[PDB]
Amino acid sequence: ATQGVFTLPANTRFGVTAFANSSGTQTVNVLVNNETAATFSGQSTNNAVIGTQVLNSGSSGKVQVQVSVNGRPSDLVSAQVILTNELNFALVGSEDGTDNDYNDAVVVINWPLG
Amino acid sequence: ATQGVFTLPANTRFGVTAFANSSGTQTVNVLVNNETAATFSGQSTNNAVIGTQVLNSGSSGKVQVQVSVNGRPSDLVSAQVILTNELNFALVGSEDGTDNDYNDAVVVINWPLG
Amino acid sequence: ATQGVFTLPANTRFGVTAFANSSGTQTVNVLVNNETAATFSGQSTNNAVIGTQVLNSGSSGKVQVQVSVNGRPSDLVSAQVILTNELNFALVGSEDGTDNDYNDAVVVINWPLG
Amino acid sequence: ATQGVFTLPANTRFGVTAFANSSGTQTVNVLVNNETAATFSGQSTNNAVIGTQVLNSGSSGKVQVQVSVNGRPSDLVSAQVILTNELNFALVGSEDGTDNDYNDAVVVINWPLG
Amino acid sequence: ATQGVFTLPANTRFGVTAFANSSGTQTVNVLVNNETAATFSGQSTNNAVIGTQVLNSGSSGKVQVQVSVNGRPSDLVSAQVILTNELNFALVGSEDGTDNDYNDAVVVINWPLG
Amino acid sequence: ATQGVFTLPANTRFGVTAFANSSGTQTVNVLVNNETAATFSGQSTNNAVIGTQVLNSGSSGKVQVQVSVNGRPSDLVSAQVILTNELNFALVGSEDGTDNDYNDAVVVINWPLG
Amino acid sequence: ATQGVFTLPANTRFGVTAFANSSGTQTVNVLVNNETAATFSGQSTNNAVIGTQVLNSGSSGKVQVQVSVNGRPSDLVSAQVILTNELNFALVGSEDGTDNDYNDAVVVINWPLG
Amino acid sequence: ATQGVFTLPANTRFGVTAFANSSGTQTVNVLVNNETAATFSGQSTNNAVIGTQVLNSGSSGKVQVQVSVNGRPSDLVSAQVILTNELNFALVGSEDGTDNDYNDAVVVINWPLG
Amino acid sequence: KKLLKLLKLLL
Amino acid sequence: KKLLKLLKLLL
Amino acid sequence: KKLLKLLKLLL
Amino acid sequence: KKLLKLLKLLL
Amino acid sequence: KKLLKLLKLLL
Amino acid sequence: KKLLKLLKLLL
Amino acid sequence: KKLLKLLKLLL
Amino acid sequence: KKLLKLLKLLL
Ligand SMILES: [Ca+2]
Ligand SMILES: [Ca+2]
Ligand SMILES: [Ca+2]
Ligand SMILES: [Ca+2]
Ligand SMILES: [Ca+2]
Ligand SMILES: [Ca+2]
Ligand SMILES: [Ca+2]
Ligand SMILES: [Ca+2]
Ligand SMILES: [Ca+2]
Ligand SMILES: [Ca+2]
Ligand SMILES: [Ca+2]
Ligand SMILES: [Ca+2]
Ligand SMILES: [Ca+2]
Ligand SMILES: [Ca+2]
Ligand SMILES: [Ca+2]
Ligand SMILES: [Ca+2]
């Protein structure tokens, strides 16, 4: 199944934050309406924040997270969870190798803000 | 029901990251072994990271997140989500007032690391 | 925080299924547009299905689950989870006593159908 | 990533329930310790329960859900969610065709029971 | 050894294509079941296609290529190559003179088609 | 293994001819020295020649055949065969779908010419 | 594409011979009608014959060559060539490493015998 | 056309292996640069290996195979096949009588080695 | 559990 | 409703 | 024949 | 923001 | 870690 | 060779 | 086989 | 090119 794609309410600010846990340098691309809106890159094996940003979901509300290492797409896992019918988390894990810890880049999208 | 309490595997490194979305200064306390293991404090209405750190889950794995604003405890909502039976997110929202956006301090715990 | 309330797309068919795990007879009420749309009652300590049915989410999409035992409201916990940006689960647990297993009535709402 | 595999606490009763939403006849296999422990089969486009059962996770705690339609494996999506650090849901959607509603067989695993 | 004879599956369509690389006019005769099925004639020193056609291998599958220049038979070389146990090439070269480039008429037979 | 790459004698004329056997429009790219030297495009289910051309293998002798359909690379199979130590055929088949007849574009390279 | 699979005439004796050119110990398995009919094992960097054997193609004529080193399947390349429409060679190369010489185990099948 | 002559890369090790399938004793002569480098002799109707050796192609790369039975040269068929532009087979069949099975001595040359 | 059921289990 | 398998069979 | 395309052209 | 509290104090 | 993956293969 | 690939990484 | 050529030599 | 027949006539 497709992973890393989320439909947000339109014209809504959201946070996006990426953590790294891998020897490989992670490149996280955040697309809004199928166009790159942010790119994070960094390397850490200790959960360092390689990027955090506030974006707007725009007219489509379509947000997609992609992860690559050395130009190779990582395998993604994702889900969205809603607490008390209002607080939203869109969650992404990614695997760049063979150990299947799926934490090599971890991306958390949260809304609403403010 | 109790919120903000999570049983992790014991003596395991985990990430904890707190975001702020409120006029009030947020104080996030993370308890391990029922003792304060980290405290984050900050103020943002733009989802700024007020703290991110690697902690150890300790001898029982019990991790508790508390949030307060000017000494008053915030009301918490939480859940844990597991992707591909491996990747763990422990999620906390909190409300310091009356609008019930539950984003005033947002806390994300993730494991495994590395 | 409020629990057991979910915003569905309006006028949309959804499944609702209730399971019982308690000595007490559980009464599950499902409200659509603040009015009772279905009521399930039964007793089981073996997770028996006490009701399953297709309902319609109504003009506002607002769906609320209530649980009571001996006329006393049970304490609720809830969340919504979305898989591959399309498959929705709205999940409720409830506690009628002191052991805090929160399974005394378990309610699962799922959509889309068909 | 692997989907439909869940590690439960050992020697623990759990419920497993399957709903069908497809023209195709759904076959749901539930494996415990890599051996078939239950099989449900049925057809419905209206979320009918094709099976519900109580199983024991056994010494390994490994539970795997498989879904097939006339022998062809369906594509699975899954996640586990934990409420108030105690109430567990292991959720599975499955797609047998091309429309990607992933509801063709919906499987819910819940624990604890009793 | 006999050259330019190939056993195809019976009653099967095949392509036959002839190229010319000689001062002399090439006459390529394609026999099926020992009877002429096609004759190509042309002159080129630039590998021009002097014939390309689809034929049927007939009741025995026996296909034979003969090449002559002004009535004199050319010396032939041939082989059949099968890729991934399914894609067949039957190859013929021919020499009408003394330089032994064996390209004076080059014939490629290929099957299956469609 | 890599397929569709051939080392020709350097600075040598060779013929390249492509046949189509598919519902999809075939695009054949012929690279010499890692730069496109010819592109053929056409559609046939009857082995029509979609391109034939004379090229020079250049200083390196490296010739590569690529096949795509609607921008998607086809799976290639290839080999080279030499008759009487002089007459060379470089052979390519390609599969654009699922039936594995590997004839969807068939490419034959031959040398020497003249 | 599938490699190392050949359709022989039914009920026909054939030879199969394997050569080794690698630091790794090669295990060559020859299947007839999908059942192991011969296994060769040995180590050489000088093209030593690690096995030669006469087999019968049986009623199916299906012969498959597999190669592994320390339990890891090698990548195969293969083709069949027919000389004077009667003498058959089924050829296999295999690569157990990164230099892509594809000679690590070389397997030659020839028929007819006698 | 000349058969059994092959141009190898210079100064390259190659394997040469001969099999016998005839009532007659086969004599295989392998010439490098027009000088005998190996001679095999034997008799088998069961595809026995009558010789296998490693030779060097020398500065000229010219290799020639000749087959005689009771002093009478056999009729030869031959071809060279290259897989993944790297693995080379030079193949010879020979006929010492009238049945034209061309297997009476079968010679396989392969390179590279090592 | 009701006290009667608890007493059945305990006793 | 396996319309792709139906199309394959009919066309 | 690429029936995925025809089918979506369908519906 | 506690603006409601402020307005209640002021008015 | 590329280095570690090959070390595990070797040892 | 087993080890010459490791050596290539280290060197 | 040598039978036929023996027979031709002989007869 | 086949010249010998014609060249023979020349002579
Ligand atoms: Ca990893
Ligand atoms: Ca990792
Ligand atoms: Ca608030
Ligand atoms: Ca807020
Ligand atoms: Ca309870
Ligand atoms: Ca209970
Ligand atoms: Ca579906
Ligand atoms: Ca469906
Ligand atoms: Ca010529
Ligand atoms: Ca010529
Ligand atoms: Ca095809
Ligand atoms: Ca085709
Ligand atoms: Ca190798
Ligand atoms: Ca090797
Ligand atoms: Ca013979
Ligand atoms: Ca013989």
TrEMBL record, chains A, B, C, D, E, F, G, H:
Signal peptide: none annotated. GO terms for molecular function: carbohydrate binding. Residues 6-113 form the Calcium-mediated lectin domain. Keywords: Lectin. The keyword Translocase does not apply. This is Fucose-binding lectin. The lineage of its organism: Bacteria, Pseudomonadati, Pseudomonadota, Gammaproteobacteria, Pseudomonadales.
